[PDB]
Amino acid sequence: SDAVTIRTRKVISNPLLARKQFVVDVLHPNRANVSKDELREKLAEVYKAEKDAVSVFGFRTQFGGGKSVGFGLVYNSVAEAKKFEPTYRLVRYGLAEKVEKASRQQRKQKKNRDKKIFGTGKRLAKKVARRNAD
Amino acid sequence: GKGKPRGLNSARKLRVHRRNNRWAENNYKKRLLGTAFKSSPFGGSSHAKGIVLEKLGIESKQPNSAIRKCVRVQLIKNGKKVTAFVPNDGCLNFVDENDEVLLAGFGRKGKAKGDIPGVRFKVVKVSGVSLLALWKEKKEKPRS
Amino acid sequence: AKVHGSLARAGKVKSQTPKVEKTEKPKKPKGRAYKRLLYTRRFVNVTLVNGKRRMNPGPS
Amino acid sequence: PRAPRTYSKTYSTPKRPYESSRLDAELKLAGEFGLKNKKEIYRISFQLSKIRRAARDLLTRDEKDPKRLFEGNALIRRLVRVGVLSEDKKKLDYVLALKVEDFLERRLQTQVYKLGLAKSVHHARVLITQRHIAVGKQIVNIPSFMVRLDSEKHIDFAPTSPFGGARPGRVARRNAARKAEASG
RNA sequence: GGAUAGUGGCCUACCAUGGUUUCAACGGGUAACGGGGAAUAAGGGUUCGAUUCCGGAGAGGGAGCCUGAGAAACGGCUACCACAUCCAAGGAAGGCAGCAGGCGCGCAAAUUACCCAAUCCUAAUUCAGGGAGGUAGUGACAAUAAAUAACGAUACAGGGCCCAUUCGGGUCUUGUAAUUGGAAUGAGUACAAUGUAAAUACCUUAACGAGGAACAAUUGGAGGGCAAGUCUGGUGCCAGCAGCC
Numbered sequence: 001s002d003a004v005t006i007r008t009r010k011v012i013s014n015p016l017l018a019r020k021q022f023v024v025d026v027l028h029p030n031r032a033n034v035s036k037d038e039l040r041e042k043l044a045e046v047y048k049a050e051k052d053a054v055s056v057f058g059f060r061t062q063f064g065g066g067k068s069v070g071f072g073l074v075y076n077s078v079a080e081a082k083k084f085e086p087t088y089r090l091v092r093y094g095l096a097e098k099v100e101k102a103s104r105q106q107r108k109q110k111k112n113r114d115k116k117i118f119g120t121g122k123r124l125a126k127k128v129a130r131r132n133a134d
Numbered sequence: 135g136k137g138k139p140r141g142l143n144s145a146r147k148l149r150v151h152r153r154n155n156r157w158a159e160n161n162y163k164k165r166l167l168g169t170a171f172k173s174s175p176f177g178g179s180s181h182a183k184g185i186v187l188e189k190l191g192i193e194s195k196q197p198n199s200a201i202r203k204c205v206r207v208q209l210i211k212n213g214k215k216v217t218a219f220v221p222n223d224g225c226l227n228f229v230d231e232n233d234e235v236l237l238a239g240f241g242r243k244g245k246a247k248g249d250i251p252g253v254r255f256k257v258v259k260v261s262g263v264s265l266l267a268l269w270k271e272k273k274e275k276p277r278s
Numbered sequence: 279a280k281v282h283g284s285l286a287r288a289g290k291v292k293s294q295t296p297k298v299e300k301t302e303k304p305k306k307p308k309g310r311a312y313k314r315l316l317y318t319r320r321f322v323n324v325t326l327v328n329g330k331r332r333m334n335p336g337p338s
Numbered sequence: 339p340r341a342p343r344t345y346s347k348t349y350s351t352p353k354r355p356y357e358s359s360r361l362d363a364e365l366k367l368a369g370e371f372g373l374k375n376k377k378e379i380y381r382i383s384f385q386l387s388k389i390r391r392a393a394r395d396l397l398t399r400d401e402k403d404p405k406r407l408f409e410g411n412a413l414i415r416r417l418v419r420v421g422v423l424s425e426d427k428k429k430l431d432y433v434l435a436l437k438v439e440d441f442l443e444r445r446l447q448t449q450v451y452k453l454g455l456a457k458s459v460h461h462a463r464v465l466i467t468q469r470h471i472a473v474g475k476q477i478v479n480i481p482s483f484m485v486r487l488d489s490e491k492h493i494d495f496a497p498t499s500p501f502g503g504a505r506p507g508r509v510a511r512r513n514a515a516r517k518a519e520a521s522g
Numbered sequence: 523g524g525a526u527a528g529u530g531g532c533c534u535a536c537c538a539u540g541g542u543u544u545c546a547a548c549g550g551g552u553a554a555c556g557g558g559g560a561a562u563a564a565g566g567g568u569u570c571g572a573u574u575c576c577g578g579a580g581a582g583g584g585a586g587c588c589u590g591a592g593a594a595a596c597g598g599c600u601a602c603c604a605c606a607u608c609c610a611a612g613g614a615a616g617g618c619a620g621c622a623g624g625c626g627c628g629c630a631a632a633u634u635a636c637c638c639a640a641u642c643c644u645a646a647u648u649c650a651g652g653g654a655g656g657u658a659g660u661g662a663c664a665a666u667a668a669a670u671a672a673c674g675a676u677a678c679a680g681g682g683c684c685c686a687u688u689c690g691g692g693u694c695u696u697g698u699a700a701u702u703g704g705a706a707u708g709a710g711u712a713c714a715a716u717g718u719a720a721a722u723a724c725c726u727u728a729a730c731g732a733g734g735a736a737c738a739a740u741u742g743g744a745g746g747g748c749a750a751g752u753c754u755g756g757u758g759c760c761a762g763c764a765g766c767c
């Protein structure tokens with residue numbers, strides 16, 4: 001690009017979650033769409049820790065472009081980053097994968113159906129099979 | 135002493151006196167008696183829907199000689215009968231018979247509008263297709 | 279009075295008016311430019327100031 | 339559920355619709371300042387009424403009343419910052435009769451025309467709404483900005499816009515496109 | 523004295539004959555849940571408040587009750603009343619004034635969508651759940667800002683000033699063009715990234731995206747109140763228009 005000049009503002013240390021909180025102020029003249037995925041490494045070698053210990057979110061472009069403001073988090077190590085960052089933000093970075101699950105409508109069906117059954121239901125399963133024969 | 139009491143402890147007389155004379159007003163009369171609820175064929179509403187029964191040849195009041203081409207409509211929600219005017223040049227042809235029409239007042243707030251005697255409602259929609267749009271041939275009346 | 283009459287002659291003149299259609303004319307500006315146009319003909323123009331600054335006097 | 343969103347109206351229509359002494363005056367204000375509606379004048383007069391209402395309520399109070407001085411200073415300063423009020427008239431008695439077009443002439447509509455580079459108010463209205471303006475470092479396309487006497491020297495063409503460089507222009511780009519292919 | 527968790531005619535036995543009322547009792551109506559508030563107001567006022575917050579009541583109408591700290595609970599139970607579903611006629615199962623949706627009623631009001639990421643709540647609990655809530659869809663109920671065009675050169679129509687050399691140029695204006703040109707960009711498509719739980723849009727931005735026959739602003743009115751026709755054609759107290767005249 002040209003004059004990316006990533007800047008961090010209002011930096012406050014958060015040792016409660018072993019993290020540094022700061023506002024990612026981006027100046028990108030003649031550029032747009034600063035591609036927060038690329039904000040991770042440029043914020044990594046600034047703090048020198050690693051690329052997978054930094055998370056970026058927010059980044060609403062100002063009126064007319066050429067400037068962006070968002071929020072950034074950098075962790076001491078990836079161990080606490082995986083244990084603190086939300087699961088939704090991790091899958092964006094590729095750290096975790098989508099957990100396969102039926103739609104919210106379908107889960108409600110299964111819970112309601114399973115309420116009609118008392119016990120495991122194996123005894124009922126053979127009983128209806130025995131009854132269905134005759 | 136100008137009539138009305140002036141005593142500092144005569145607010146009871148003044149408030150009760152004002153209550154008794156407030157009845158000589160017409161809006162305060164209709165509002166508290168709820169006449170529009172009990173009378174005035176609508177239910178205090180501005181529009182009503184009904185079925186056309188026939189066409190009328192009402193003649194003009196003085197000084198005026200003309201036929202006004204109104205329609206008798208029986209309302210849906212209460213079954214009352216009213217007479218309603220069909221305003222435009224030749225719009226009696228779109229309201230032929232048994233159609234389900236929407237009616238509105240004339241802006242006189244409950245009385246007859248012009249030299250049309252005893253008519254205090256007008257047709258605003260026939261078959262729910264906005265009669266005004268028919269006169270300007272913008273829409274088409276439904277076939278049924 | 280009477281409630282009967284001649285209902286067979288409703289719409290006499292409207293259906294009798296000869297059909298003259300709208301002539302094609304250039305579009306007028308919309309919005310601000312119209313206020314620009316109207317300001318010009320009224321204040322900085324003296325076209326019709328015959329006796330009383332009429333706006334649309336009849337042709338005479 | 340959630341708290342309601344507060345909204346307010348910012349204009350008021352005159353009581354008499356058709357009065358010639360005001361009808362032509364309205365077209366005067368919209369005439370040489372490029373306004374598309376009477377609501378621009380209607381809007382301006384609304385807080386002009388609100389300013390006078392606040393000022394009238396201040397003069398009724400006794401002199402040296404802390405409330406008279408506090409919101410008196412705030413009102414007198416806030417209009418001076420906008421610039422609709424001159425520095426000399428800082429007595430709270432000249433704010434009552436300021437003018438009806440004093441607010442209007444402080445708009446970005448006029449400032450672009452005042453400080454050259456527009457050569458007509460009707461050209462400027464396009465220029466602001468065409469997104470070639472930087473009142474500060476930021477692009478603005480709202481003709482009613484009410485410049486604050488701290489940014490009048492800061493109006494300039496936006497860097498990411500023609501007439502300010504960094505691009506030739508959109509339609510000019512395809513204009514030379516035929517020129518290049520025709521020469522071949 | 524019984525009962526209640528308690529005071530108390532709350533109930534019981536006995537006793538006394540009291541208690542409220544023209545300063546409007548009692549009774550009747552309310553298209554009456556009450557307030558915080560809303561509309562309009564020089565000042566005094568008038569009208570409204572089903573409804574984002576507080577308090578109260580209700581779960582079709584009543585009554586009764588279990589459990590539980592807390593319910594006379596209704597997405598808890600029992601009975602009657604009114605509705606009402608399925609049955610191989612022996613029986614069984616019900617309360618959407620929760621979210622969508624349907625039928626009715628009407629002048630009158632939207633999706634049988636997505637999600638627990640945000641707000642917060644519940645549980646044995648960091649994890650599960652939550653039509654509470656949030657997101658998106660319909661939505662001209664109301665509000666805010668704000669496009670639909672801007673600028674040149676040629677042809678007409680004006681007032682001073684250079685000359686004071688017939689009325690010659692007019693250097694300067696402000697508009698009039700079935701004259702011509704460059705520019706400017708947005709609605710609309712869109713690689714992309716941004717956004718988001720995942721998305722759609724907004725803000726950015728490659729690229730594509732104005733010259734009129736185009737990318738075309740309507741709604742009303744023109745005798746007066748109330749600016750705006752003594753124009754043309756039709757009608758001929760008819761049609762019609764006309765809040766009032």
Ligand SMILES: [Mg+2]
Pocket residue numbers: 140141142143144
């Ligand atoms: Mg007295």
Ligand SMILES: [Mg+2]
Pocket residue numbers: none
């Ligand atoms: Mg006792």
Ligand SMILES: [Mg+2]
Pocket residue numbers: none
């Ligand atoms: Mg006792």
Ligand SMILES: [Mg+2]
Pocket residue numbers: 554
């Ligand atoms: Mg009620």
Ligand SMILES: [Mg+2]
Pocket residue numbers: none
């Ligand atoms: Mg409540």
Ligand SMILES: [Mg+2]
Pocket residue numbers: none
């Ligand atoms: Mg209850």
Ligand SMILES: [Mg+2]
Pocket residue numbers: 582
């Ligand atoms: Mg019900």
Ligand SMILES: [Mg+2]
Pocket residue numbers: 596
């Ligand atoms: Mg109950």
Ligand SMILES: [Mg+2]
Pocket residue numbers: 597618
């Ligand atoms: Mg229920």
Ligand SMILES: [Mg+2]
Pocket residue numbers: 618
């Ligand atoms: Mg429902």
Ligand SMILES: [Mg+2]
Pocket residue numbers: 742
């Ligand atoms: Mg019109």
Ligand SMILES: [Mg+2]
Pocket residue numbers: 744745
């Ligand atoms: Mg008229």
Ligand SMILES: [Mg+2]
Pocket residue numbers: none
């Ligand atoms: Mg006409």
Ligand SMILES: [Mg+2]
Pocket residue numbers: 749
């Ligand atoms: Mg007039």
Ligand SMILES: [Mg+2]
Pocket residue numbers: none
């Ligand atoms: Mg007409």
